[PDB]
Write an enzyme that holds these catalytic residues in place. Structure first.
Site, PDB file in Angstrom:
ATOM      1  N   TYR A  49      -6.077 -19.873  62.559  1.00  0.00           N
ATOM      2  CA  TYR A  49      -6.268 -20.072  63.980  1.00  0.00           C
ATOM      3  C   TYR A  49      -7.768 -19.999  64.231  1.00  0.00           C
ATOM      4  CZ  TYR A  49      -2.100 -20.857  66.751  1.00  0.00           C
ATOM      5  OH  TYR A  49      -1.130 -21.542  67.459  1.00  0.00           O
ATOM      6  N   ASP A 195     -14.754 -46.268  74.589  1.00  0.00           N
ATOM      7  CA  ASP A 195     -13.779 -45.866  73.592  1.00  0.00           C
ATOM      8  C   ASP A 195     -14.027 -46.763  72.394  1.00  0.00           C
ATOM      9  OD1 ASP A 195     -11.551 -45.370  71.954  1.00  0.00           O
ATOM     10  OD2 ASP A 195     -10.169 -45.323  73.685  1.00  0.00           O
ATOM     11  N   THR A 221     -11.498 -42.300  67.668  1.00  0.00           N
ATOM     12  CA  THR A 221     -10.734 -41.731  66.579  1.00  0.00           C
ATOM     13  C   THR A 221     -11.666 -41.498  65.395  1.00  0.00           C
ATOM     14  OG1 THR A 221     -10.137 -43.944  65.797  1.00  0.00           O
ATOM     15  CG2 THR A 221      -8.632 -42.860  67.344  1.00  0.00           C
ATOM     16  N   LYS A 224      -9.236 -45.232  61.359  1.00  0.00           N
ATOM     17  CA  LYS A 224      -9.616 -46.635  61.529  1.00  0.00           C
ATOM     18  C   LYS A 224     -10.860 -46.952  60.702  1.00  0.00           C
ATOM     19  CE  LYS A 224      -7.320 -46.316  65.916  1.00  0.00           C
ATOM     20  NZ  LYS A 224      -6.965 -46.714  67.319  1.00  0.00           N
ATOM     21  N   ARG A 230      -6.707 -38.697  60.446  1.00  0.00           N
ATOM     22  CA  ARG A 230      -6.177 -38.939  61.781  1.00  0.00           C
ATOM     23  C   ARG A 230      -6.635 -37.837  62.737  1.00  0.00           C
ATOM     24  NH1 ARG A 230      -2.178 -42.965  62.613  1.00  0.00           N
ATOM     25  NH2 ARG A 230      -2.856 -43.660  60.524  1.00  0.00           N
TER      26      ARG A 230
END
Ligand code: 5M5
Ligand code: 5M5
Ligand code: PLP
Ligand code: PLP
Ligand code: CL
Ligand code: CL
Lengths: 409, 411
Positions: A49, A195, A221, A224, A230
């Site tokens: 955590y 974006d 992201t 890509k 991811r």
């Protein structure tokens, strides 16, 4: 040996590695991360955590996890020139969620690219948090040229007085003029959010104009074209914005970060600082242009807008008597993956569509060169031209096998 | 070893964190050690697959085997908890809860949820969180004397404010949560009931805590914590109409593509939780927590909130030792014992100082600790907190820590 306990799970995973080996991945948003990225995601960092930010966590034991997250933060600033980076977004969607939270209030008018024109769902779709939460006005592409008409975007902005203008796309193959978006935004007093998820790797390689100096906030992201795990990421040059961004991500919309994934972002970012990554990205664009050449000259495969500047292209297939979903199905049967995709001014259902989307980042990663990319486009045109002809579709499957054996994983 | 050479900065840090996990007593109540198989799943080539949509209804092809994986996770979750529908795509507990709210209420609706100081989570109505910002949350807490939920007060609040939804579940509450009494209060006022079982999901799966799934309209959870899976979220329901709202809320509502390699790790972890041994594990968790509570109950300075635990965790008011939660956390950190500072009911200090610490046994239990060892841990914690920086005493605690970690090494 741990696989013995759960044979069904590991059998599916094994068949999936076989699938990626034997198919041509032309889905424009996909790639193959490195062994080092997968190793980071498979690390013990999943146990930690770490709510909060480096040096400001909400419990103990983060002294070394903070090294990992700092490397990811600092490599993003190095790659993109932003003064501030946030690497905790679990996805591109969450990154966009928090970037909106830092720029606008619920109900505010936002100008974003129409989905049929090539925008993402998070740029205003009514089935998405973006369309549900904010008042989105769409801009599109010109019907004849199928490129963005900045004077029309300007008409729209003055008519609608948006608080925010969003640039960036999931299915737009031409250079986005960020400087013109900034002028338009300034002129109506709106902020500018970009974006760059699809093009982040081309931006990092210097092969697409960098939006960061123009945009109030840049989201992306890490997968890509960046060839990362991811996940999502948020950049800005305004310290006051960075603070809102950070509060928006946590405790605003997320809890603990995925530090094993963030470790994979750090790995990927350093891969992208290597000169080899610019050669990789140069090859992405050249392979895409080569394939576009083949489609422009083939019969039935209309490239939207007639060229590509980046990694992807949209193919209008209406002149083969089929739709995108049938095109997607045909090619899937000869071991070629694409996705059905709405085209500008789409008349069919978003689940049939009039076209398909094709990108080169994945095959370029496998080592394909222009010669091999030309070949794939020829195989794609052969399959779609072969009106349900098993002899010809088996030929195509042979050509796909030749290519995949030539370029294993 | 070769990729480690290209990036020594990154991998030496991960090497340090491996050493740290091996040499520390991890008492953070929400942490655990996932199995080698889970980690192997998150490290698979499944990170390369886009799978927007759901099994059998993706937005493009190539998902034949990603659908097996995700259907395994879905089916094993239905079986673990006995729900008719399961969604395994949420990236986290916060996403799970975000989507569940969207399936139950409209922006601005009144929601009853547990107050942060009293043990509730941030997503149960904190004003700095999407939950507090988006909905009109009214908080219930615990009774100041017994520090347990007063269900007559929940009833009183529910009737006064007429919530559209009541939320049950907690992050720092050590006692059994009576879901039947929540279901009966919701029914009396016509509210829906949402239960967030993130912390107790594993105890629930083991049958050692009452199952909320038959009482809650929707149940959310993490897949880490006592369930001991990868970091992620999940949404459970028995109502088919809600199931459709849930699935729409997750995608394309608030997420794009799911993390299919994490979902593989969820499938791995759910099968581990279906094993009969997981029940022995979870029982050891509770017995270890109760053993630690007994020790803290006998030391002055370490007041256990409500004086007892029924689950894996305990909340400790440290103020009579002349310190706050932040100082305790860092004292313990200096002797290789990692907790988190934590607000206690009716907290008087800043939320970034706090009056207490939160301790849980899931992690040490996972590396083999028994009640005898759980007792030594609590004694070491008592010693460290009372030591007043006496280095001889703190170094003794470090030795006690070293003894325990060497006695119970990691995989
Ligand atoms: C999943 C997604 N997110 N953002 C996107 C997608 C795309 C997509 C594809 C499809 C294929 O049936 C449907 C949708 C869709 C959107 C809204 C309502 C109903 C269906 C969207 C692509 C990039 C995956 C797509 C298209 N077309 C582009 N333009 O943007
Ligand atoms: C991070 C988190 N999310 N949900 C939680 C937390 C906890 C926590 C801890 C801290 C420690 O400085 C501060 C806060 C806090 C959050 C927002 C505003 C003010 C203070 C919250 C715990 C479980 C980590 C917490 C406590 N206390 C409990 N009750 O719930
Ligand atoms: C893919 C994409 C997203 C969403 O990323 P996810 O990780 O699937 O949630 C957002 N914006 C753009 C422009 C994208 O291409
Ligand atoms: C930990 C927790 C959450 C948040 O889960 P995340 O993955 O960190 O977003 C939500 N609810 C409860 C009860 C929790 O304990
Ligand atoms: Cl996409
Ligand atoms: Cl927690």
């Amino acid at each position: 040996d741990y696989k013995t306990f759960d044979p069904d799970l590991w059998a599916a995973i094994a068949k999936e590695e076989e699938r990626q080996e034997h198919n041509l991945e032309l889905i424009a948003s996909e790639n193959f991360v490195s062994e080092a990225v997968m190793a980071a995601q498979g690390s013990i960092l999943t146990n930690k955590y770490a709510e909060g930010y480096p040096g400001h966590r909400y419990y103990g034991g983060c002294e070394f996890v903070d090294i990992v997250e700092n490397l990811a933060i600092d490599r993003a600033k190095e790659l993109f020139g932003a003064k501030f980076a946030n690497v905790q977004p679990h996805s591109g969607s969450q990154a966009n969620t928090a970037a909106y939270l830092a720029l606008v209030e619920p109900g505010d008018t936002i100008l974003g690219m129409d989905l049929s024109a090539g925008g993402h769902l998070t740029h205003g779709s009514p089935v998405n948090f973006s369309g549900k939460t904010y008042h989105f006005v769409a801009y599109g592409v010109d019907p004849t040229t199928e490129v963005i008409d900045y004077n029309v975007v300007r008409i729209l902005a003055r008519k609608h007085q948006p608080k925010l203008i969003v640039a960036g796309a999931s299915a737009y193959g031409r250079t986005i003029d960020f400087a013109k978006f900034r002028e338009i935004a300034d002129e109506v007093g709106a902020k500018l959010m970009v974006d760059m998820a699809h093009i982040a790797g081309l931006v990092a390689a210097g092969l697409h104009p960098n939006p960061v100096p123009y945009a109030d906030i840049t989201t992306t992201t890490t997968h890509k074209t960046l060839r990362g795990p991811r996940g999502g990421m948020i950049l800005t040059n305004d310290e006051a914005l960075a603070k809102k961004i950070n509060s928006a991500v946590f405790p605003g919309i997320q809890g603990g970060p995925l530090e094993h994934v963030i470790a994979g972002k750090a790995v990927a970012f350093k891969e992208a600082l290597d000169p080899a990554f610019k050669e990789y990205s140069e090859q992405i664009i050249a392979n895409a242009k080569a394939m576009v050449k083949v489609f422009n000259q083939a019969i039935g495969t209309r490239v939207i807008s007639g060229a590509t500047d980046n990694h992807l292209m949209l193919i209008d297939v209406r002149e083969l008597g089929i739709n995108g979903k049938e095109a997607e199905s045909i090619l899937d049967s000869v071991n070629i993956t694409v996705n059905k995709n709405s085209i500008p001014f789409e008349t069919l259902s978003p689940f049939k569509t009039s076209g398909i989307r094709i990108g080169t980042p994945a095959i370029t990663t496998r080592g394909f060169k222009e010669e091999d990319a030309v070949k794939v486009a020829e195989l794609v045109v052969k399959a779609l031209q072969a009106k349900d002809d098993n002899a010809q579709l088996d030929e195509v499957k042979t050509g796909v096998r030749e290519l995949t054996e030539k370029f294993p994983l």
